């Protein structure tokens, strides 16, 4: 038998008609339609005498098949002449690494082939007339939608994971290239950004430290810190682009033209010939998708954003009712509105995410990258508003810096400690307990090594995505760039949390969730726009907070109109300089730009020779 | 052969130099030098012909022209309706091609290829220009550049096709502009201007119609001003975004959009140590980017800032001169005083012209000294330098009257002079007067040829003598600047001067015919440049639409109608205005981001070609 890489779990009582049909499509050659992979059940006929196979099936492929699949996805690898080119089976000897493809790459290729399994003449899933099919429809999608296939997931490499673990937690630089090799470009990019952002916050943590310790509340002192803050915000987000470009080029994912990739299983449409790639795949009119975006999805997001402000106002009206009652058991009643609002926020965030996931799926995006960018953008604007609208209200409407400091202190200390317990420490404790339980059950049987590994990973938690992880750092960047003049220790507590966040998130990836399917990402996606918008908002925030300070208002006792005009002029000058600085700093280093240019030139010379 | 390009040499150039120049223009590319055809204007001279002896005609073979078309990378439509770069080996696959036919490449394309080959004529072992030891040479140095710098070669220019120009003329002046016909004769750059001119005139029409009842019925209300300014800010973004889409359609059809101009050979003005290019692998001059960057930010940038400060200093003298003139009219009491009021405006306008001609010489010098590799880079940097100076001299006085003096009566009168009197005088100076003078020279040349009485046909002789002494078209800058300043008065001060767009459309209705006469019967044929966009002008026009948000919000916030609502709380009023301004600037950027710069069908056509290039690279590395 083969090396098992991907597991497919089928429902409770799936018909044999369906099982054999699914087996045929996963085994049959691509010429006859269907992936040319290998299919086998978790347990053999001999071991099925005791341990019955609970409709769990293992998927693998040939060494030649894997290399042909690597060409299909367009994996870029380094050649002997140190140039990065897309892999081809005919040109396999020219590649430097040629153990060539990692397990993560192998499992991604298998996932890609299973996702591109499309219905030919089948009018339904055999045995299930309710689960109707049409030419071009993704089989894996229809199987998951109907509920015939419960889940498809890649298997962990216990020995490889343990080797990475020892080089990961502990003191030195994070092994981003090792994380890439096991989890993929997307997960390694997150741990690469986390390590970078922690180092990026260090200057702001060191500069902000004497502002708290010696209580520096002067005009000159605040202007110096805010000026440094605005320069820091631009320079770190610009230097990240350059650093990411170096890393993704080395990986080869930067040279990948992801726009020509095959559509996601969730993409529906009339089967036809693609105008660009020439592939027989589903076709959906862009205007239908655009109308759903701007006429249904956009007004819904705006309604939820308005409702968020409406709910926030109820909390600030509830804090008035609670303060009046305390002024007239009362000390307990003061905590009550903060407890209620925080609970309502959690109810709102879980409900909006279901509505956002539905609408982005309904929008019908062709590529997974597009679906992700649109889904992140929807959930992010809602999560940002619910988190910062109350903070902005205290700072600029209430103008209560004592309450704002206490609000930020809860968010940066108590909330981050509780977050780490809920995020990885508690789920790890619970997963470790399940791990012993399963291990003991297998010992009592009297070779179920792979059986135990599949049963364990099957019931393990599914990693939802890098969104929740990046959002933590986005909100961190929010408190630091916006209110560092109010709370100078903002960056100090951000670095302290991030010092344990690397260890906690690693533990969450290794011993909590089952292996997530690798995605060849070339950047942090729509997060770059999000972080850059936050650095633009920080100009407005820092200029307002300085203009609001009683030190500046002492200079302008009557002429308050003049003061605002000066502040607005300074704000406009800073916003212009911020854009010039971002334009002046190239998003890619010189050597990467030249390497990308020579490859661009080669493609044009190749097209002239081929025609 | 058929003469296409003319090379004029200085009055007494040595035969050593003439034969050497002839050799480099005729010798095969393998031995170094363009594989073109060289011949003198006349083989038979007379007394009146002996003067015009150093005139030489340049042409090329049909095969040579096609090989030269491949070298520049001209993109033409294939039989499968796809746009691909020309190759002599793949010549049969291109639509409209026939070996016996010479109608494939236009005269404008042909003359561009010849110019390109003459510009890429580089010195091999020559340590100087033969016969002129002062005009030193080194390996890699452009011969055409050194010949023009030393003064051995006076000028190099393409010849007009009289019959073709007359056919275009009848379809041009008088319906929609024949942009594809202008492209065929003058090139992508000149046709792009007339394409933008025609578009901008149509784009201004809504603003001219909306602004018309604001003047006629004198609509000076809060609601009325907000509606117009809101429409103005939406209009500014949408027209500049729709232009990008329209330009993309046109440049794709032309093929210039599919051209990768970044890999093109350097301009003749580019100097450096001869070496191998890291990207193209071509043996061309090499210059370190850091040296160019230091010259830009440490010498050129502070100079531009000094001239910009001096412009504000000179402007202040004018606003101090208008005070001296207002006092001399008012303290005295006669008629002679009414004449003295016009005097400072006349002096300042003259000083501005002296400043603009002097700064342009300094800007042309510094951009050449910066040492840019591509002609596109030299143009974008030169446009940007001259534009910030021309914009400041034109608008600093307008901004001073509007926000320092806060005199809307004076601002209206200032814009009225700029949009009516100044635009009428501009058209006379731009084409009407130079055409009158060129027509007079035309009669003088025709009479000179009639007096010859030679045993040869002096049709080509007359054509060369005429076009040689004709004015040289400096570039599309002055032409685009007119429309940029127009867009400036319209997008910024439409709330103050509602007829701004009305007079802009009226001038542009004659500008099309005035600039057509200018390009046909005033200047000699300009060398075609395959442009794929309006260049740095897109950034300039977009910055103007960003400034218009600040301007319209300030002018509305300043109006006594809004200040009537806020009698004491002036701080609150500014906070509302600034909040509205920030919201509009955000929405303006979102709207520009939402509108795709290229249409769906062009994006797909560009995508399939991008995919084909990757599939080609995979097949070539396999080969
Ligand atoms: Ca955490
Ligand atoms: Ca996390
Ligand atoms: Ca940048
Ligand atoms: Ca004019
Ligand atoms: Ca003009
Ligand atoms: Ca756009």
Numbering used by the authors:
A (entry chain A): 14 to 111, 117 to 188, 192 to 349, 354 to 471, 475 to 639
B (entry chain B): 15 to 188, 193 to 641
Per the authors:
TMEM16K is a widely distributed, but relatively unstudied member of the TMEM16 family. Here we show that TMEM16K is an ER-resident lipid scramblase with non-specific ion channel activity and a dependence on calcium ions and short chain lipids for optimum activity. We present structures of TMEM16K solved by both X-ray crystallography and cryo-electron microscopy, revealing a classic scramblase fold, with extensive conformational changes propagated from the cytoplasmic to the ER face of the membrane, which lead to opening or closing of the lipid transporting groove. The TM domain of TMEM16K is C-terminal to the cytoplasmic domain and has ten TM α helices with TM3 to TM7 forming the lipid scramblase ‘groove’ and TM6 to TM8 forming the binding site for two Ca2+ ions, seen in other TMEM16s.
To understand the structural basis of lipid scrambling in TMEM16K, we initially solved its structure by X-ray crystallography. We obtained preliminary diffraction data from vapour diffusion (VD) crystals of full-length human TMEM16K, which we improved by lipidic cubic phase (LCP) crystallisation to obtain 3.4 Å resolution data. Both structures were solved by molecular replacement (Methods section). The structures were similar (monomer all atom root mean square deviation (r.m.s.d.) = 0.75 Å), although the crystal packing differs, confirming that the conformation is not dictated by crystal contacts. All the protein samples used in cryo-EM were purified in the detergent undecyl maltoside (UDM) with cholesteryl hemisuccinate (CHS) added to improve protein stability: the same lipid detergent combination that was used for the VD crystallisation. A fourth Ca2+ ion site on the ER side of the membrane at the dimer interface was seen only in the LCP crystallisation, not in the VD or other structures, so this site is likely to be the result of the crystallisation conditions, not a characteristic of the protein or this conformation.
